Amino acid sequence: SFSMVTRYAHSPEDIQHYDTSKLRHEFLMEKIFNPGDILLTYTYNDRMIFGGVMPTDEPLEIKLSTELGVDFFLQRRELGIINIGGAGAITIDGRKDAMSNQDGYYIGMGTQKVVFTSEDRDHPAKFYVVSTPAHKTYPNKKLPFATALAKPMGDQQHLNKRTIYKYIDASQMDTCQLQMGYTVLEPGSSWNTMPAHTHARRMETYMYFNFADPETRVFHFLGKPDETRHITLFNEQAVVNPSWSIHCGVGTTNYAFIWAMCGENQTYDDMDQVAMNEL
């Protein structure tokens, strides 16, 4: 009950006649949180590894050495974490730090052992993890939801009314590549990232969760700004957006998602806002 599947990169021109079911196979991770299991995917867009760890009875660790050609998982890599589930803790090189809901952690390169645990076996913590390669070691930082920064954004005229939470951000901390965040749209608002953009120099991954209703749906937009497609998401699913693709979404109700951005730069404003011509 450990899984890591591989996904490739593509030309924009490669996906152009792609059907939905194969669009979903290349870009969408359908199952992320299954009790007791580790579910991760390895994308060749800047080699991001993301997925989820849901420990229940016995604690879990992402144990990967030979597969990545190293002796331990984070020998050459950094790792972000946000817990969207129940109460838990992670022990990091022995230091056990409790993790309550929407608490996050940045763990830099060189950390040998990271064990995730849950406190209650039937109300587990859901650890959404993102690991990205790192050439320099930076300090570990716990990112409490209490300390988590809340920025008002949106109007109801644009149906984007929401609150963004910065977790791993270059202005508040030092990492190599990884940037992480969390967005809750308020009820009555469905649009995320709507005035849209592409960033040639880095990529992003959206993971949608906490759907308002069991029947809620998210339509995540994808593709090159002139040629766009969409994928339809159930709760707790994720979509890799390559550097040449835009990324936005709409729900039938409100929801939340975590964004994880990485690439060769951390500059936030190296990006092209797509004017509204999208065919």
Q: What is the Cα Rg of the chain in Å?
A: 18
CA distance 9 to 7: 7
Instruction: For residue 167, report the phi and psi dihedrals to the nearest 5 degrees.
Output: -105, -75
Which residue from 98, 191, 77 is spatially nearest to 145, judged by alpha carbons?
A: 98
Integer CA distances (angstroms), 51 to 54, 147, 199, 225, in order:
10, 25, 23, 27
Closer residue to Zn ion (CB): 193 or 237:
193
Binding part of the chain for Zn ion, among 88-96, 141-149, 179-187, 197-205 by CB under 5 A, reads: 197-205
Binding part of the chain for Zn ion, among 142-150, 180-188, 196-204, 222-230 by CB under 5 A, reads: 196-204
User: Per CB under 5 A, which of residues 203..242 are in contact with Zn ion?
Assistant: 204
Closer residue to Zn ion (CB): 92 or 246:
246
CA distance 226 to 246: 10
61 labelled ligand-binding: no
DSSP label at residue 278: -
Give the nearest distance from C-beta 262 to Zn ion in angstroms. 11
204 labelled ligand-binding: yes
Number of chain positions touching Zn ion (CB under 5 A): 1
User: Per CB under 5 A, which of residues 118..147 are in contact with Zn ion?
Assistant: none
Q: Is 61 in the site for Zn ion (CB under 5 A)?
A: no
Closer residue to Zn ion (CB): 61 or 204:
204
Query: Which residues of this chain interact with Zn ion, rule CB under 5 A?
Result: 204
